[model samples]
Target: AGATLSRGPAFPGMGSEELRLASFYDWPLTAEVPPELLAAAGFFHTGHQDKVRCFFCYGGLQSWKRGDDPWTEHAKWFPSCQFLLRSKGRDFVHSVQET
Candidate 1:
């Protein structure tokens, strides 16, 4: 099983109190996931011991994979996520899964 899906913020990007902290991948040998990737995918940091939650989608990606594509994984895991389908077209996401 993978990280469970859960809602993050009240609004689209982040809630009023959400830290929405900048992305930092300096956690000892972890992959260097760009801040842009996380933001672009509509994700916000929970600031609680290495956690990530989606803004639009009610799911999150806690475990990080080296060289893992955010959109690819997002599509793979949260297919019904609003932000995912909105950001990446349906066909595009399906194409990723077909690979």
Candidate 2:
């Protein structure tokens, strides 16, 4: 876990504190996630309801609901995802839960 803290490998279109801000303008009415939040949360769209999958981790969330937060949700379902671990930290991954 100590080695993990020193790592901050990056992603394209995924930098800056401004990324994680919520913008629900384009979220599908039937689906809960907004595009910006997904991108900010380290996800690319799958061209489907759920966001494409995590770049840092291999997990993809299918069972979703309204008001679901991408980072917390990703952590909830895919705790071991390398991307989540790298980007958010193991403690972050271990701690986040969908509200």
Residue 78 lDDT in model 2?
73
The CA lDDT of each predicted structure is 0.63, 0.60
How much lDDT does candidate 2 score? 0.60
Q: Which ranges of candidate 2 are over 4 A from the true structure?
A: 1-29, 97-99
Q: Which whole-number lDDT from 0 to 100 does residue 95 have in model 2?
A: 66
Candidate 2 TM-score, true structure as reference: 0.58
TM-scores for all predictions: 0.66, 0.58
Candidate 1 backbone collisions, by pair: none
Model 1, span 1-99: residue lDDT tens: 787655443455463223343543332244356555665676666654445677666467777665777778788887877668867989978887787
The most accurate candidate by lDDT is: 1
Error of 2 at 17 (Å): 12
For model 2, residues 36-91, the per-residue Cα lDDT tens digits are: 76767766555435545665554566556768888887788877666676678877
| RMSD, candidate 1, Å | 6.5
Give the backbone clash total of model 2.
Answer: 1
Query: How well does candidate 1 match the true structure in TM-score terms?
Result: 0.66
The all-Cα superposition gives candidate 2 an RMSD in Å to the true structure of 5.4
